[PDB]
Design a protein around this ligand. Structure first.
Ligand SMILES: CC(C)(COP(=O)(O)OP(=O)(O)OC[C@H]1O[C@@H](n2cnc3c(N)ncnc32)[C@H](O)[C@@H]1OP(=O)(O)O)[C@@H](O)C(=O)NCCC(=O)NCCS
Ligand SMILES: CC(C)(COP(=O)(O)OP(=O)(O)OC[C@H]1O[C@@H](n2cnc3c(N)ncnc32)[C@H](O)[C@@H]1OP(=O)(O)O)[C@@H](O)C(=O)NCCC(=O)NCCS
Ligand SMILES: CC(C)(COP(=O)(O)OP(=O)(O)OC[C@H]1O[C@@H](n2cnc3c(N)ncnc32)[C@H](O)[C@@H]1OP(=O)(O)O)[C@@H](O)C(=O)NCCC(=O)NCCS
Ligand SMILES: [Mg+2]
Lengths: 96, 95, 274, 273, 191
């Protein structure tokens, strides 16, 4: 847990029989920012998005722009047929 | 390094080693740390070996949580005020 | 003396030793190859440079690559240290040779040094057996920046065209490029830090040249390593940029540009108090 | 100032003016042509020289000729004034740039001058309208030797290979060569005096280059005549020979040659009493 | 820009920094001393060199010594690397500046280097605290020759006049000469 920079690790159930230890289930989070240290051990680690609907093609486009730059470009569609659209500068202000 | 004090040019010393900066400037009690997320941890830990420094501002966004916890621990035990990480800092008008 | 030497009565040791060119013959000889053969075999500037500098008949790809280097290093505007001096000089009414030399004399350390520096640094690291990541960290610890890494504007999304042109030629025609491969792996690490920490043209030429000397098959390891050390790579930049500098000199003369005097406003006078 | 200039509040005139290269762009530009186009169009060293020195896209035969000149002027042994100084310098433990410059600084008058001199002399004579025989005699009367005429061993029967190589390329590819024709006619006269009074490589390059500028069709006469005057021809020799000199520098370092001190036996001391 | 700067509306940092000479004034200033004072105080070439190179008003003995150095180093025949190149160059029909530079460009390592080298070597050894004999042996072990030691003809019985002239001036006018004393002790060992 420490050596691979986890922030959360759960094994439910952990099974111990006469034969040995079995890890039946595993739920974990890693501190993604530790990549510069752990890249070697983690490899090409993938962080899945939470279960739910998949990204519209426009969401995927913006995600690609964000990943390829030092700038923050975020977009999530709530109601495609809504009449109120926002293009706000800053993580704080966008919430407000 | 050349800088401006209004319209008058002044010189600010630049040091390779922090040890030399501290030695030549005992009047300093604040350190503003622009080290990248990779070297922010080590440079902050190093600063805390100089008792004159009482406040450290850590600008870097992206320091692993486990490391920040270690910085917090050392700062707490040494009485050093940490502003940050991932901050612009603060402002005291007139000061 | 002339006569005694003719009859072989006396011996006098030569003070000088040469091995690149022999003008004494019926025909001019460049490193064993007569001038007519040089043209007949279509050597080119690259080919001729191979004989005079390395005293070797290099493969065609090698010659073409040398010519390519000379072309990308030809000029880089008038803002650079060397160009500036040559322009100042030309403007101060001097001749071609004086103006050129005035500029060339800035080449060496902080200006034009990078080619040699990069080649040396990367060779050392590769040959020492350290892996790219170990190298990156070694340099950080030693308080040294990597030579041939970094660009002002160009990034991993916005590439340098000169680097693109050269990388592609080398990939296509060089049988083996192990040092270039190593350097590109170092670039993978540095660009993951800051995006503009790209393998620049000075680094690209440096490592490519080392790969050309070692893997073209004309040189022993000793020979390839000596050529790097004695500064053959400095020669490439000097010869290459010499074109640009002559270019500027002619330009200023053609533009009928007057004497330069630096404005006082750009000068910070910090003289002792009387 | 940075900020004021951004908001376009102030203007400050440039002290400098350039027209050969622009490094500020997304791509490097050589006289209007972007570096990728330079390679795509297969310009070569000759082509690049045309852009930086003349700010012209020259015909392929002109580029190939320029490259040819750079090749024949590359070296001529270590006995020459410039090579000698570079060698001395390299031997005195100096760096490449110092050693090269030490040698280059001898180029100009009695060493390396002949190309420019020949071109200028023959152009003057041709353009003045005097016939080759009138020219030969004019020079004799003025007590002047013809620049680009004569050789130590090479004669009319035993030709100079460098001159042969170049003469042949020029005849084959140049549309017109009036100055070369004039010079060769002067050579017919001088060789009829002494057989070794041939048109040498300095003379050949000089007059060939003038014919290339004037008749390649990229330059106006004014342009061609200005380029000769401002010393483009000196540039050819300097750039060309720079290879040979770097060659010698590397050679002396590789040969691990010690410090040179001139022997006193070769020096005639004629001091006051 | 000229106007905006006059009214102090904009600021632009200087790209250059100087501290040796100011030509902008009513009078020319060399390191704080006006040119008329330079002559009035009878500084000489040595004095002027002290201001421009060190930005200091040196004692008269120091100035006189600098002038003395410049005099003994003036020439040493045409056989030397630099002289040779300058002569070759002059003979190849070049101008003064080209001919001079051609020669000067040989100065640095194997030719003209010794002054700097000797000063550096001896300073290091003295300052490191090693005694002259320890120094001599250290150099032998390291496979290094002492810089500023040795002569082709001149010996301990047949002295170099230039060295005699200079030694004697220094002994007479320098308040203290500890490094010279150290070097002369090294010379006792090598001779
Ligand atoms: C912290 C912050 C202010 C500065 O970050 P930055 O500009 O990316 O950081 P630096 O200027 O220190 O450079 C990044 C790295 O490039 C390295 N580097 C720069 N030029 C280099 C070169 N030519 N060769 C090798 N490494 C080089 C530096 O060593 C530094 O390494 P590090 O991250 O291990 O310390 C910024 O990230 C921020 O605003 N964060 C929020
Ligand atoms: C007469 C002799 C001494 C000199 O002849 P030479 O070497 O051919 O003559 P020069 O050195 O004067 O050169 C010939 C010409 O070339 C010209 N010339 C040389 N270099 C030149 C150059 N670069 N450009 C132009 N003209 C040039 C000279 O001006 C000279 O012109 P000129 O004939 O109109 O005066 C010689 O031929 C000789 O020894 N002859 C033997 C005669 C004999 O048998 N004697 C009797 C014993 S029995
Ligand atoms: C043995 C013999 C052939 C050679 O002796 P030599 O010429 O006096 O000896 P060298 O050439 O080795 O020089 C003498 C010493 O001067 C030293 N030396 C020479 N130049 C020096 C310099 N500039 N700085 C310091 N030491 C120097 C050498 O290191 C050598 O030291 P060592 O005696 O501890 O080895 C001779 O003595 C003989 O004929 N013997 C009978
Ligand atoms: Mg479960």
């Amino acid at each position: 847990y420490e050596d691979l920079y986890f922030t959360y690790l759960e094994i439910n159930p952990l099974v111990v029989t006469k034969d040995g230890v079995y890890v039946l289930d595993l739920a974990a989070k890693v501190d993604a920012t530790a990549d510069y240290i752990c890249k070697v051990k983690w490899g090409d680690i993938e962080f899945p998005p939470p279960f739910g609907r998949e990204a519209y093609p426009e969401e995927a486009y913006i995600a690609d722009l964000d990943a390829k730059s030092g700038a923050s470009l975020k977009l999530t569609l709530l109601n495609p047929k809504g009449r109120i659209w926002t293009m706000v500068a800053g993580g704080g202000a966008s919430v407000v | 390094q050349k800088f401006y004090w209004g319209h008058k040019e002044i010189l600010i010393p630049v040091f390779k080693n922090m040890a030399d900066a501290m030695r030549k400037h005992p009047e300093v009690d604040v350190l503003i740390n622009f080290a990248s997320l990779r070297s922010a941890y080590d440079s902050t830990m190093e600063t805390m070996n100089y008792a004159q420094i009482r406040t450290i501002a850590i600008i870097a966004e992206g320091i692993p949580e486990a490391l920040t916890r270690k910085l917090i621990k050392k700062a707490d035990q040494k009485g050093v005020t940490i502003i940050g990480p991932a901050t612009v800092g603060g402002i005291k008008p007139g000061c | 003396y002339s006569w005694a030497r003719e009859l072989g009565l006396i011996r006098k040791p030569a003070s000088f030793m040469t091995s690149i060119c022999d003008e004494r013959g019926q025909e001019l000889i460049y490193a064993g190859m007569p001038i007519t053969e040089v043209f007949k075999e279509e050597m080119g500037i690259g080919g001729v440079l191979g004989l005079l500098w390395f005293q070797k008949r290099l493969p065609k790809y090698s010659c073409q690559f040398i010519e390519m280097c000379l072309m990308v290093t030809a000029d880089h505007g008038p803002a650079v240290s060397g160009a500036h001096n040559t322009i100042i000089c030309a403007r101060a009414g001097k001749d071609l040779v004086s103006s050129l030399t005035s500029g060339l004399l800035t080449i060496g350390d902080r200006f034009g040094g990078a080619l040699d520096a990069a080649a040396k640094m990367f060779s050392k690291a590769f040959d020492s057996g350290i892996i790219p990541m170990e190298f990156v960290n070694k340099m950080k610890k030693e308080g040294k920046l990597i030579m041939g890494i970094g660009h002002r504007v160009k990034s991993i999304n916005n590439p340098d065209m000169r680097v693109q042109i050269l990388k592609d030629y080398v990939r296509q025609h060089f049988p083996a490029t192990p040092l270039l491969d190593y350097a590109l792996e170092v670039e993978k690490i540095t660009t993951s830090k800051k995006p503009n920490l790209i393998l620049n043209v000075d680094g690209l030429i440096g490592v490519a040249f080392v790969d050309m000397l070692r893997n073209c098959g004309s040189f022993t390891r000793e020979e390839a390593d000596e050529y790097i050390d004695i500064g053959a790579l400095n020669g490439i930049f000097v010869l290459g940029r010499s074109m640009g500098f002559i270019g500027h000199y002619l330009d200023q003369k053609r533009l009928k540009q007057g004497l330069y005097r630096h404005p006082w406003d750009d000068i910070s006078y910090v003289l002792p108090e009387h």
